[PDB]
């Protein structure tokens, strides 16, 4: 193994990992990750066995997709909020995972799905049976069945209601009939969620990913923010440094608003997907090339600032609900783009997220199942712990090698992402600093930022273009080049205030201030 120039350069910078809520988070689908008992389904024991891998990648947080009992493979429709799904193992396996995570200073985030339950959840079964029991006269009585007010039942088909089979009643189920929506205005419901947050916090959970936060109270954004506020306070009441990140799948003008709840993070969705800011810039669909990435960072930061001066952005770029990054880039320098997309994701301010498999450029988009294929550990047929993945996934042609092979390749996507995360772990200002887009020095080819945290300043220079570019950054002050990312043998250079970046590369400087 012969290390690239970037590897040698970046290694000379000491890790500076701060134990707070600005981390690098690996999002795992337990189902498709690593199988410990040989049934082809991934499990908690399997995840535990692969913590050396995740830690070696440089991630110091894990978010698992839902781990509680569910009739589906994906497990977003929950039947029991205080156990583990039998396919994943037991509560004892969860306890061991937490212990092993904390020993490695890795924090654990669980997917917290309270906008709906499964229609097989006992609360709904009981409400449904009760509703069906009522004579024509009717009008439910929550003293006879309190669960009737845990969900929204009506004789009227408003928006997102489905029929309760064999009756004249309907119930709210925005996503699908098998996912009835919880009434989060119910004090009884809030009482139940209280017990649930106590349960998971008491087993050493560090935070929550809040699913579907903008659908907490259907179309009523006021009640939704009230609901989120209640939840954020319920959690922080019990553990002050508990971390919470909300999924608000919408534009930034909308998801900025949810920061009024006091939540730490909202996922930064306008930077996600093929047609998000990162994707558009790399595929040449942006009005101002590289500088569009600058403008977008500033516009979103400025929007959030309307609501809070005290937050952690959640850049993620891709997740289990979207086509994998590698599928966004085809033809000439697709690999270069695939790498740089993750530089543009992971070197953003706040708490950065990496979806499992993105570090080896896994492909898959045709349907949701196909976005959640088995982690490609190895090419070997019968390697221990390989997962079969979801049963209804479409055919998908991969374009990059398996992980074992990528580790051995100094110019693999894996080694690039690994290098990216090392830069982030070396310079706390990248995640925590105030962000300044140096617009006067940026153009369609290069994008320049200064990051300032507690009197330390760094300069980030991205070249997400197919063209070599030079920039005079001497106006920013006296700088030293400390880190870089290269997508080919061509490496960034820096001399006497002039930076030269080849196509698809990054250069990091420290400013010296006297």
Ligand X SMILES: OC[C@H]1O[C@H](O[C@H]2[C@H](O)[C@@H](O)[C@@H](O[C@H]3[C@H](O)[C@@H](O)[C@H](O)O[C@@H]3CO)O[C@@H]2CO)[C@H](O)[C@@H](O)[C@@H]1O
User: Pick from Ca ion, ligand X, none: which does 39 bind, CB < 5 to 8 A by kind?
Assistant: Ca ion
In the complex with ligand X, which residue's Cβ is closer, 113 or 483? 113
Question: Is residue 37 within the footprint of Ca ion (CB under 5 A)?
Answer: yes
In the complex with ligand X, which residue's Cβ is closer, 245 or 403? 245
Give the span between the Cα atoms of 183 and 381, in whole angstroms: 48
- Provide CB contacts within 8 A for 360, sequence distance 6+: 376, 400, 401, 402, 403, 406, 412, 413, 414
Question: Is residue 485 within the footprint of ligand X (CB under 6 A)?
Answer: no
Give the span between the Cα atoms of 220 and 217, in whole angstroms: 6
- What is the footprint of ligand X within residues 113-142 (CB under 6 A)? 113
Give the span between the Cα atoms of 389 and 371, in whole angstroms: 10
Q: Within a 10 A sphere around the Cβ of 120, how many other Cβ atoms?
A: 15
User: Pick from Ca ion, ligand X, none: which does 175 bind, CB < 5 to 8 A by kind?
Assistant: ligand X
Please check whether residue 215 is in contact with residue 179, taking contact to mean a CB–CB distance below 8 angstroms.
no
- What is the footprint of ligand X within residues 89-118 (CB under 6 A)? 113
Nearest residue to 95 via CA among 46, 53, 54, 45: 45
- 161 DSSP β-pair partners: 172
Q: Which of 212, 245, 423, 458 binds ligand X (CB under 6 A)?
A: 212
Q: Which of 4, 25, 34, 35 binds Ca ion (CB under 5 A)?
A: 35
Residue 227 token pair:
């609901």
CB 71 → ligand X: shortest distance, Å?
Answer: 11
- What is the footprint of ligand X within residues 306-365 (CB under 6 A)? 320-321
User: Pick from Ca ion, ligand X, none: which does 176 bind, CB < 5 to 8 A by kind?
Assistant: ligand X
Residue with tokens 């960034």: 492
Q: Which of 43, 111, 247, 335 binds Ca ion (CB under 5 A)?
A: 43
User: Pick from Ca ion, ligand X, none: which does 368 bind, CB < 5 to 8 A by kind?
Assistant: ligand X
- What is the footprint of ligand X within residues 154-183 (CB under 6 A)? 175-176
Question: Is residue 39 within the footprint of Ca ion (CB under 5 A)?
Answer: yes
Nearest residue to 348 via CA among 276, 294, 275: 294
CA dihedral 147, 148, 151, 156 (to 10 degrees): 170
Give the span between the Cα atoms of 463 and 507, in whole angstroms: 9
CB 180 → ligand X: shortest distance, Å?
Answer: 12
In the complex with ligand X, which residue's Cβ is closer, 78 or 282? 78
Nearest residue to 279 via CA among 296, 254, 263, 267: 296
Question: Is residue 67 within the footprint of ligand X (CB under 6 A)?
Answer: no
CB 329 → ligand X: shortest distance, Å?
Answer: 24
Give the total of residues touching ligand X (CB under 6 A): 11
CB 120 → Ca ion: shortest distance, Å?
Answer: 22
CB 35 → Ca ion: shortest distance, Å?
Answer: 4
Question: Is residue 141 within the footprint of Ca ion (CB under 5 A)?
Answer: no
Question: Is residue 27 within the footprint of ligand X (CB under 6 A)?
Answer: no
In the complex with ligand X, which residue's Cβ is closer, 212 or 458? 212
Question: Is residue 384 within the footprint of Ca ion (CB under 5 A)?
Answer: no
Residue with tokens 């200002």: 429
Give pairs for 132-139: CB < 8 Å, separation 24+: 132/164, 132/166, 132/167, 132/169
DSSP class of residue 213 equals G
- What is the footprint of Ca ion within residues 338-357 (CB under 5 A)? none
Which residue precedes each gap in the chain (C to N above 2.5 Å)? none
Give the span between the Cα atoms of 339 and 370, in whole angstroms: 21
In the complex with ligand X, which residue's Cβ is closer, 210 or 473? 210
Q: Which helix (H) or strand (E) holds 449?
A: strand 447-453
User: Pick from Ca ion, ligand X, none: which does 74 bind, CB < 5 to 8 A by kind?
Assistant: ligand X
CB 86 → Ca ion: shortest distance, Å?
Answer: 10
CA dihedral 44, 68, 374, 381 (to 10 degrees): 50
In the complex with ligand X, which residue's Cβ is closer, 320 or 363? 320
Residue with tokens 């039998």: 86
Q: Which of 74, 405, 439, 466 binds ligand X (CB under 6 A)?
A: 74
Give the span between the Cα atoms of 242 and 52, in whole angstroms: 24
Residue 201 token pair:
């916090």
In the complex with ligand X, which residue's Cβ is closer, 247 or 335? 247
CB 41 → Ca ion: shortest distance, Å?
Answer: 4
List phi, psi (to 5°) of 372: -125, 40
CB 241 → ligand X: shortest distance, Å?
Answer: 24
Q: Which residues bind Ca ion (CB under 5 A)?
A: 35, 37, 39, 41, 43
Q: Which residues bind ligand X (CB under 6 A)?
A: 74, 76, 113, 175-176, 211-212, 247, 320-321, 368
């Amino acid at each position: 193994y012969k290390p690239s120039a970037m590897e040698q350069m970046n290694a000379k910078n000491d890790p500076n990992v701060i134990q707070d809520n600005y981390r690098t988070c690996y999002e795992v689908f337990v189902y498709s990750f690593f199988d410990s008992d040989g049934d082809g389904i991934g499990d908690l024991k399997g995840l535990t066995e692969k913590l050396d891998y995740i830690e070696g990648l440089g991630c110091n947080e894990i978010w698992m997709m839902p781990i509680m009992p569910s009739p589906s493979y994906h497990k977003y429709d929950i039947t029991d909020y205080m156990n583990i799904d039998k396919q994943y193992g037991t509560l004892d396996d969860f306890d061991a995972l937490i212990t092993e995570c904390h020993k490695r200073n890795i924090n654990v985030i669980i997917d917290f799905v309270i906008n709906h339950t499964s229609n097989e959840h006992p609360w709904f079964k009981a409400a449904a049976d009760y509703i069906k029991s009522l004579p024509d006269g009717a009008e439910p009585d929550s003293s006879e069945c309190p669960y009737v007010d845990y969900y929204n039942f009506s004789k009227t088909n408003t928006g997102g209601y489905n029929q309760l089979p064999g009756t004249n009643w309907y119930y709210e189920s925005q996503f699908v009939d098998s996912m009835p929506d919880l009434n989060l205005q119910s004090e009884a419901v809030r009482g139940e969620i209280d017990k649930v947050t106590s349960f998971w916090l008491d087993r050493g959970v560090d935070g929550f990913r809040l699913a579907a936060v903008i659908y907490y109270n259907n179309n009523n954004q006021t009640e939704t923010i009230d609901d989120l506020t209640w939840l954020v306070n319920n959690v922080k009441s019990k553990k002050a440094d508990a971390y919470m990140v909300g999924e608000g799948w919408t534009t930034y003008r909308e998801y900025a608003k949810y920061y009024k709840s006091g939540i730490d993070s909202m996922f930064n969705f306008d930077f996600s997907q093929q047609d998000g800011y990162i994707g558009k810039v790399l595929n040449g669909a942006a009005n101002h090339g590289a500088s569009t990435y600058g403008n977008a960072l500033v516009d979103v930061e400025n929007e959030i600032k309307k609501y809070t001066d005290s937050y952690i952005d959640a850049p993620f770029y891709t997740n289990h609900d979207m086509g994998r990054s590698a599928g966004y880039y085809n033809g000439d320098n697709a690999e270069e783009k695939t790498k740089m997309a993750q530089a543009m994701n992971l070197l953003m301010p706040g708490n950065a997220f990496l979806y499992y498999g993105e570090e080896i450029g896994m492909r898959g988009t045709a349907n949701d199942e196909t976005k959640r294929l088995a982690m490609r550990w190895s090419g070997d047929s019968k390697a221990k712990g390989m997962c079969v993945g979801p049963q209804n996934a479409e055919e998908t042609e991969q374009t990059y090698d398996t992980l074992d092979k990528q580790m051995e390749d100094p110019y693999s996507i894996y080694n690039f992402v690994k290098q990216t995360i090392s830069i982030r772990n070396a310079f706390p200002e990248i995640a925590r600093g105030t962000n300044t887009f140096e617009k006067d020095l940026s153009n369609d080819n290069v994008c320049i930022f200064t990051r300032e945290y507690n009197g330390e300043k760094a300069v980030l220079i991205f070249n997400p273009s197919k063209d070599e570019a030079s920039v005079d950054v001497s106006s920013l002050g006296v700088n030293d080049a400390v880190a870089m990312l290269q997508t080919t043998a061509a490496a960034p250079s820096y001399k006497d205030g002039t930076a030269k970046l080849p196509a698809y590369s990054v250069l990091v400087l420290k400013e010296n201030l006297y």
